[PDB]
Amino acid sequence: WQDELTVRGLVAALLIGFIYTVIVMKIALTTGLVPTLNVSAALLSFLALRGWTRLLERFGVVSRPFTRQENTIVQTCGVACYTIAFAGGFGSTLLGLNKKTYELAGDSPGNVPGSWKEPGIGWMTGFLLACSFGGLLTLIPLRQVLVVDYKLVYPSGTATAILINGFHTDQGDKNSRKQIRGFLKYFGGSFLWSFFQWFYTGGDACGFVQFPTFGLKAWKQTFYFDFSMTYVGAGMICPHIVNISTLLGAIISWGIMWPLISKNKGDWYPAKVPESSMKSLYGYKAFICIALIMGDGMYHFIKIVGITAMSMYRQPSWMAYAGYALFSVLAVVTIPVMFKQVKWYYVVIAYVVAPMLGFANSYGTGLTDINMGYNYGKIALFVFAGWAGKENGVIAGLVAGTLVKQLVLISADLMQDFKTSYLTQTSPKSMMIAQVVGTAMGCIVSPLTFMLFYKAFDIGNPDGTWKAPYALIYRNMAILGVEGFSVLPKYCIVISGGFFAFAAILSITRDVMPHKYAKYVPLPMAMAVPFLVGGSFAIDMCLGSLIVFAWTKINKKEAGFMVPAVASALICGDGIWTFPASILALAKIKPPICMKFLPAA
Amino acid sequence: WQDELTVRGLVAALLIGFIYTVIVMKIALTTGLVPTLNVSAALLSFLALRGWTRLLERFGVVSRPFTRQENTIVQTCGVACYTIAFAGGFGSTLLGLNKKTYELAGDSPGNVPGSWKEPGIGWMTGFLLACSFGGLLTLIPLRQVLVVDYKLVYPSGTATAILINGFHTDQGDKNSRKQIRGFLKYFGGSFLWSFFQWFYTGGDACGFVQFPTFGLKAWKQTFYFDFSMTYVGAGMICPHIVNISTLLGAIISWGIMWPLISKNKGDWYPAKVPESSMKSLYGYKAFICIALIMGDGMYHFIKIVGITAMSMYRQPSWMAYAGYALFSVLAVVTIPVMFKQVKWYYVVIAYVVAPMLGFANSYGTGLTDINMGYNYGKIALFVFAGWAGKENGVIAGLVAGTLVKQLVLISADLMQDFKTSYLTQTSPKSMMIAQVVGTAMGCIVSPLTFMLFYKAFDIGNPDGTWKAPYALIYRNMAILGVEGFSVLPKYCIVISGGFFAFAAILSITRDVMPHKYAKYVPLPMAMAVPFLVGGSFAIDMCLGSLIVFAWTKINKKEAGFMVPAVASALICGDGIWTFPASILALAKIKPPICMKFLPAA
Ligand SMILES: CC(C)CCC[C@@H](C)[C@H]1CC[C@H]2[C@@H]3CC=C4C[C@@H](OC(=O)CCC(=O)O)CC[C@]4(C)[C@H]3CC[C@]12C
Ligand SMILES: CC(C)CCC[C@@H](C)[C@H]1CC[C@H]2[C@@H]3CC=C4C[C@@H](OC(=O)CCC(=O)O)CC[C@]4(C)[C@H]3CC[C@]12C
Ligand SMILES: CC(C)CCC[C@@H](C)[C@H]1CC[C@H]2[C@@H]3CC=C4C[C@@H](OC(=O)CCC(=O)O)CC[C@]4(C)[C@H]3CC[C@]12C
Ligand SMILES: CC(C)CCC[C@@H](C)[C@H]1CC[C@H]2[C@@H]3CC=C4C[C@@H](OC(=O)CCC(=O)O)CC[C@]4(C)[C@H]3CC[C@]12C
Ligand SMILES: O=C(O)[C@H](CCN1CC[C@H]1C(=O)O)NCC[C@H](O)C(=O)O
Ligand SMILES: O=C(O)[C@H](CCN1CC[C@H]1C(=O)O)NCC[C@H](O)C(=O)O
Ligand SMILES: [Fe+3]
Ligand SMILES: [Fe+3]
């Protein structure tokens, strides 16, 4: 109630949200490769408030103690502010509504002349306010099921909680000193390792990140080992079945399926169209991946509904969904006003499957630490574009894809904060207040921050500094999506439906068999992540589990309490370097050297 | 007397000498990059005899115990056999006497038509027998002064002794178990690290060995860090002043002198002639390096002579030099018979400065673990070629350079064995018997091994498989050396004479000042090694001393007895991989990938 919600925290979150919005917005409008900055926000939240308390002590002013619960509140409030900058599709979808992006796509069916909208402070802020708080209300019922009931470990949320607890621990114990000193040795090593790596990533696909540890043939199949301590640290605190399932999905997809499907580059799909398109080999990637996720996701979401339905029949949960319905109606009557191309029942369907789609992403983030929310928006954009003809089809796909992405992406990114608050013993109700305040500030700061860049500079020029590549890429997705499911490659629906059932069978197979065999069943939607990202992420995850397996065998006692600290330090050290690395890209300081790997030419 | 000199050891050394001769001879005649295989010979000496003892035990035959002293004898006998293969100039100097190499050099003054000699079993064996045992006799007086008196640490000899002792230790102690287990963890890590590195050294100047850790500009100045555990391990057991002096010489030479001298590429020396030549910027490299070594070397050699002369005036050593004089006379009356181009007093001068030149190389190897003997032969080849005119000048330089190199190179390589025998408590007299037997076998096996390659295949063809590049490179040195000291670049003698005095001043400055200031004086001839090799070797040496400095501060007790074992494991692990790496090059299996570093082009 108090000592967590403060005025200095409100001020500190507003600044940290403002700079991080500027960093995210500038990176989004130049390269579109927005990095993860949640770990950095926790550190700057600590330094800013600790500096303020000590500075006032220097001047004689006395202040309240700055505790870990308050640090969690400030970090969560700040994260919610700048998440809207990249979750709102400011560089991908909302910028694709430009007349400039409309002209770049060219003349084609679907791209009718009335498919452009210009940015403005008035409608972009009003667009965000109605839609952004929809994700927050769904978090209240999901918080109990996922964070504590399913015991999902959010590796980034767990690492941030251990980082924050270390900042504020003041007790001298036999283990507390060993936890901090072990954390600091690997935090500095991970930070310096990431700092050293930066000087050699000075080109397209070159550096320690693109390291062909098993050869160049395997590397082209995304079966290498990048020297990423984030994924190695993530795998250390993930259960072995999650890591093995991740490797199993990489072998099935990139080792078997994609070479086999690619053998029909002229028969099943056209060979002139580039890959990464919905028409050539990426329709398989995107639709099979979601079917695996939705196949597992639908089984689980029904199970909570079924368990709850039986419980009520035998006899604050409905408070949240009542509030969600109120915000649902607000968007239904408001979004079509801004976009005459968007019909009212499009929003209703978007807000009905949003609890469904948000649950799967939060469950997926709680397993593999990978937020897939922007992948859901691509599917929703494609589907909603096919739900309208050549008229009002591109705008409908872009706008409806933005709603689905925000509801899905916000839910997963902000459950990482509830895992952090769970470990820091922070009050959930004070967490939700920080949710709304940060979201409210984000829905205001981000549109004005975007417009200051937009009015001053020239964003969207293919030949220029401020080029937003994903504005046109998302625009071309909607143009392609105007044509219905016919443009998908041959047998794309059939195989996706098969993997939908295959994911559902594994989910049943794990809950019906005894626990003495249930622990060997792979998780279908941990398998699905390596369908879009390569197998390098899977290999890093399995290396971390290999480290923990060996460590547990060598010393059972020490590995019990030291693995989380070492894993968090690896995640935080790579996470903290993302802030100086972003400032370097902010000032256009490129790496000097490129570490290229060649076939002994 | 016994239990060290055995018949199975004689057999085992003969085989190990024979294969290693074949490996060295094939590598010398194809690339000329003969690697160090002394560490590998110790392991194969252990496995061959241990396998023999266990196999006879399997068949019921009983045999004498195989001890560490016998393992030292077998390794030393084997090393002496195959050292003659590359110390004898079979691919550099003796092969440069060919009519084929004579024709490749072309028509020029100095390259008179009578400057070729053809290989044969008769003269090549007789050439080796007279000259090879000259180096062995000089070892007896140098053994006391360098190994035990000056307390010089031979890092490769020390590492081999620790490797051999670990093989034969059978006592369970509080520390013996920790020494072996610590050694094995870093031996396997170093071996696998070198094995992993091999797949990416698949090109000219690319791999972890050519890693620009401080940038591409510093790398071209040879101021990078190669990931070599041999030099890192060598620096761990070398005193800090040796490592700091090595870094100081690299900064003075490659950081100051060579950029400054290179600013006169048209005024001081011609710009059309390539570098690495005695006429362009390598006359500075070679002559300043020897002057630093000879400046320090002459001060020391006089000091032993002065101390001994005073000791005798106040009142087996002369046994060795009496035998050396007898072998000296044998070569004086025999070498001019084979080579009418070589005069009798050329051999006398070569055999008089040989105790001098051998002492400096053994002292240098006892500090930095770098054998410079083949660098002495280049200087001796150049000087002796200028001591004869256009007539009989190229052959005189090549032959006399071969004598000087063998006397110098054998002395340094075989003092590494006396350090090994010192730590293994091996009898010096049994060591010297293994010296002669291995040398006698080497003087026979190597000429026949060479001729089998020579008769069967075509060695010396610039466009072919068996190309011996250094046969022509050494031939061109003698042709250039026919012209006297005039061809050396401008001010080469003046600067070399200055560094000769500067090296002598530091040697005096260290013996006359009190020990409380004498320990900060740099060693002039540890400084001289980075004049020819780059500063990457110096940086690796200093990193090893940095590791020991930190380890000593953190834990004084453990670093006392664990540093030699960890350092030896790093040296041995990289050393052992040299055997499989040579077999791969033996079968022409090239690395698949090249790790190239580019300026972000
Ligand atoms: C004991 C543990 C630490 C094992 C270490 C991992 C090995 C199983 C890996 C490390 C290096 C890998 C090799 C690295 C490089 C290649 C090159 C690759 O050849 C290429 O395709 C290169 C490009 C070309 O030559 O066209 C074939 C596989 C291979 C031998 C890899 C096979 C698997 C290796 C030996
Ligand atoms: C133990 C942990 C730390 C991970 C170690 C895994 C690797 C040692 C292995 C396991 C899976 C293997 C991959 C499994 C499947 C393939 C598919 C295969 O792909 C193709 O058939 C090529 C298709 C084409 O020709 O385009 C090539 C080998 C590769 C990459 C293998 C390379 C080596 C991998 C990554
Ligand atoms: C705390 C310890 C571990 C310090 C780590 C060593 C640093 C002092 C080194 C590591 C990386 C080095 C950098 C690596 C690469 C370059 C590129 C180099 O630029 C080039 O010349 C590249 C080629 C080109 O761009 O033309 C300038 C020096 C610099 C910044 C190096 C400066 C020194 C650095 C920062
Ligand atoms: C602490 C231990 C482990 C070694 C670390 C040493 C490096 C951090 C420093 C010390 C010496 C430095 C070098 C000292 C001298 C030079 C000479 C200088 O050479 C030139 O002036 C270029 C000449 C030309 O233009 O051709 C460039 C910097 C460089 C390579 C420096 C690069 C960085 C080095 C290797
Ligand atoms: O969204 C995308 O597909 C790409 C790459 C993936 N983004 C980066 C972070 C991730 C996401 O949206 O969660 N970003 C485009 C520009 C900006 O990220 C935006 O979405 O407005
Ligand atoms: O001698 C040389 O300058 C070169 C490179 C340096 N060698 C390799 C080992 C070192 C040496 O001679 O101690 N080797 C040429 C062929 C053969 O090594 C030989 O000398 O016959
Ligand atoms: Fe994005
Ligand atoms: Fe050589």
PDB file of C-alpha atoms and ligand atoms in Angstrom, chain A residues 27-29 31-35 85-93 371 373-375 378 405 409 413 470-471 474 477, ligand 5:
ATOM      1  CA  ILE A  27      16.291   2.097 -33.206  1.00  0.00           C
ATOM      2  CA  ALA A  28      12.860   1.025 -34.479  1.00  0.00           C
ATOM      3  CA  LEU A  29      12.768   3.754 -37.145  1.00  0.00           C
ATOM      4  CA  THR A  31      16.772  -0.696 -38.335  1.00  0.00           C
ATOM      5  CA  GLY A  32      13.675  -2.208 -36.702  1.00  0.00           C
ATOM      6  CA  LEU A  33      15.859  -4.471 -34.527  1.00  0.00           C
ATOM      7  CA  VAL A  34      14.553  -3.406 -31.127  1.00  0.00           C
ATOM      8  CA  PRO A  35      16.582  -5.082 -28.349  1.00  0.00           C
ATOM      9  CA  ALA A  85       6.950   2.165 -28.163  1.00  0.00           C
ATOM     10  CA  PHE A  86       7.716  -1.141 -29.906  1.00  0.00           C
ATOM     11  CA  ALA A  87       4.618  -3.164 -28.968  1.00  0.00           C
ATOM     12  CA  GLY A  88       2.407  -0.461 -30.495  1.00  0.00           C
ATOM     13  CA  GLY A  89       3.800  -1.058 -33.973  1.00  0.00           C
ATOM     14  CA  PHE A  90       5.187   2.461 -34.279  1.00  0.00           C
ATOM     15  CA  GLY A  91       7.873   1.293 -36.707  1.00  0.00           C
ATOM     16  CA  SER A  92       6.076  -1.727 -38.171  1.00  0.00           C
ATOM     17  CA  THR A  93       2.292  -1.416 -38.463  1.00  0.00           C
ATOM     18  CA  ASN A 371       8.114 -13.686 -26.495  1.00  0.00           C
ATOM     19  CA  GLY A 373       3.784 -11.866 -29.613  1.00  0.00           C
ATOM     20  CA  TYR A 374       5.005 -10.189 -32.791  1.00  0.00           C
ATOM     21  CA  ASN A 375       4.652 -13.538 -34.567  1.00  0.00           C
ATOM     22  CA  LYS A 378       1.772 -11.405 -38.407  1.00  0.00           C
ATOM     23  CA  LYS A 405      -0.031  -8.113 -31.148  1.00  0.00           C
ATOM     24  CA  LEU A 409       2.814  -9.123 -26.481  1.00  0.00           C
ATOM     25  CA  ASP A 413       6.277  -9.187 -21.317  1.00  0.00           C
ATOM     26  CA  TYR A 470       9.506  -3.294 -41.372  1.00  0.00           C
ATOM     27  CA  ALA A 471       6.929  -0.631 -42.239  1.00  0.00           C
ATOM     28  CA  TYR A 474       4.345  -5.393 -42.816  1.00  0.00           C
ATOM     29  CA  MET A 477       2.120  -8.768 -45.713  1.00  0.00           C
TER      30      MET A 477
HETATM   31  O1  LIG C   5       8.027  -6.416 -34.952  1.00  0.00           O
HETATM   32  C1  LIG C   5       8.858  -6.884 -35.770  1.00  0.00           C
HETATM   33  O2  LIG C   5       8.535  -7.851 -36.507  1.00  0.00           O
HETATM   34  C2  LIG C   5      10.256  -6.280 -35.877  1.00  0.00           C
HETATM   35  C3  LIG C   5      11.279  -7.206 -35.218  1.00  0.00           C
HETATM   36  C4  LIG C   5      10.799  -7.812 -33.900  1.00  0.00           C
HETATM   37  N1  LIG C   5      10.453  -6.767 -32.954  1.00  0.00           N
HETATM   38  C5  LIG C   5      11.674  -6.178 -32.374  1.00  0.00           C
HETATM   39  C6  LIG C   5      11.128  -6.439 -31.025  1.00  0.00           C
HETATM   40  C7  LIG C   5      10.148  -7.356 -31.630  1.00  0.00           C
HETATM   41  C8  LIG C   5       8.778  -7.086 -31.203  1.00  0.00           C
HETATM   42  O3  LIG C   5       8.022  -6.383 -31.920  1.00  0.00           O
HETATM   43  O4  LIG C   5       8.357  -7.558 -30.117  1.00  0.00           O
HETATM   44  N2  LIG C   5      10.277  -4.982 -35.226  1.00  0.00           N
HETATM   45  C9  LIG C   5       9.823  -3.955 -36.141  1.00  0.00           C
HETATM   46  C10 LIG C   5       9.908  -2.585 -35.476  1.00  0.00           C
HETATM   47  C11 LIG C   5       9.349  -2.594 -34.057  1.00  0.00           C
HETATM   48  O5  LIG C   5       9.856  -3.698 -33.365  1.00  0.00           O
HETATM   49  C12 LIG C   5       7.828  -2.686 -34.093  1.00  0.00           C
HETATM   50  O6  LIG C   5       7.264  -3.809 -34.032  1.00  0.00           O
HETATM   51  O7  LIG C   5       7.133  -1.642 -34.181  1.00  0.00           O
END
